[PDB]
Every structure is written in C-alpha cells, then in structure tokens.
Design an enzyme around this catalytic site. Structure first.
Site, PDB file in Angstrom:
ATOM      1  CE1 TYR A  27       0.463  -0.524   4.388  1.00 31.26           C
ATOM      2  CE2 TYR A  27       0.411   2.215   4.365  1.00 31.26           C
ATOM      3  CZ  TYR A  27       0.532   1.104   5.211  1.00 31.26           C
ATOM      4  OH  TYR A  27       1.613   1.207   6.281  1.00 31.26           O
ATOM      5  CG  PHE A  37       0.349   9.652   5.104  1.00 33.26           C
ATOM      6  CD1 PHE A  37      -1.037   9.318   4.000  1.00 33.26           C
ATOM      7  CD2 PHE A  37       0.012   8.789   5.531  1.00 33.26           C
ATOM      8  CE1 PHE A  37      -2.097   9.127   3.989  1.00 33.26           C
ATOM      9  CE2 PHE A  37      -1.419   7.900   6.011  1.00 33.26           C
ATOM     10  CZ  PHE A  37      -2.479   8.387   5.161  1.00 33.26           C
ATOM     11  CG  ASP A  38       2.437   4.077   6.223  1.00 31.22           C
ATOM     12  OD1 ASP A  38       4.111   3.800   6.249  1.00 31.22           O
ATOM     13  OD2 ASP A  38       1.676   3.795   6.950  1.00 31.22           O
ATOM     14  CB  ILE A  57      -8.426   3.406   8.352  1.00 31.73           C
ATOM     15  CG1 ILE A  57      -8.064   3.537   7.505  1.00 31.73           C
ATOM     16  CG2 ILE A  57      -7.359   4.663   9.688  1.00 31.73           C
ATOM     17  CD1 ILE A  57      -7.556   4.476   6.943  1.00 31.73           C
ATOM     18  CE1 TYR A  83      -5.116   6.375  11.960  1.00 33.54           C
ATOM     19  CE2 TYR A  83      -4.949   7.215   9.298  1.00 33.54           C
ATOM     20  CZ  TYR A  83      -4.362   6.429  10.311  1.00 33.54           C
ATOM     21  OH  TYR A  83      -3.740   5.476  10.273  1.00 33.54           O
ATOM     22  CG  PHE A 100      -4.792   4.090   1.599  1.00 34.67           C
ATOM     23  CD1 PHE A 100      -4.042   3.932   2.564  1.00 34.67           C
ATOM     24  CD2 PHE A 100      -5.503   5.024   2.658  1.00 34.67           C
ATOM     25  CE1 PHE A 100      -3.358   4.329   3.707  1.00 34.67           C
ATOM     26  CE2 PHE A 100      -5.295   5.215   3.839  1.00 34.67           C
ATOM     27  CZ  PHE A 100      -4.413   5.439   4.464  1.00 34.67           C
TER      28      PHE A 100
END
EC number: 5.2.1.8
Length: 108
Positions: A27, A37-38, A57, A83, A100
């Site tokens: 991902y 961010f990730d 999430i 979030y 994502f």
C-alpha cells in the site's frame, strides 16, 4: 462519503476476504493533495492485518473487503472512516480525506 474503490488492475474476481482472514497487502497512503505519508513498498515488506479486528482504519476494513485477490485499487476514504477531526499530529492533518493505492497479494 464512505469509501470509494476504483480499480487499477483486476484481481481473480473470485477470492474475497472474509472476517477473520489475514490480508496481505502492499500500500501507499497519500493525503488528498497527493503527499505520501506511508508506504509498505518503501519498506520492501508487505503489510498484514486481520479483517474485522480493527487493526486498520474503518475505510480499510470496508474497502479491502470489496477487493479480490490480486486486485490493485485506489481507495478514497473520508475522515470519519480514517483519522477523523483529530487526525494524527505531524502526519495526518485534521479532517483529512485519505487516498490509498492498495494491492491485495494473498489471504492467509
């Protein structure tokens, strides 16, 4: 909105995750503007989670469950499924819609 799933490449179209199964994914997580961010890909190791245990999430629980093994999909998740108002200080800002890029590699 909830979670929007848009296909990038199809899966087998037959194997869908059930509650209690371990999903194995790669991902990349981005803010709505495109800032990353990730990413498991930048760690060169897939990510595992068990569906229905709220290890991820809400938008992931609901979005990955609509994917078939081998599919790569773009999920767009609203803050309430993500979030929320609080976000994650220094990583995810308040009220953030998250995008994502997810590939479902296999189920265990």
């Amino acid at each position: 909105m909830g979670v929007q799933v848009e296909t990038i490449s199809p899966g087998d179209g037959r194997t869908f995750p059930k509650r209690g199964q371990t999903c194995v994914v790669h991902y990349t997580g981005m803010l709505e503007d495109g800032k990353k961010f990730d990413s498991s890909r930048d760690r060169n190791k897939p990510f595992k989670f068990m569906l229905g245990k709220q290890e991820v999430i809400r938008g992931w629980e609901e979005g990955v469950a609509q994917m078939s093994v081998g599919q790569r999909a773009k999920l767009t998740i609203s803050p309430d499924y993500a979030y929320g108002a609080t976000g994650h200080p220094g990583i995810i800002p308040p009220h953030a819609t998250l995008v994502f890029d997810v590939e479902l590699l296999k189920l265990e």
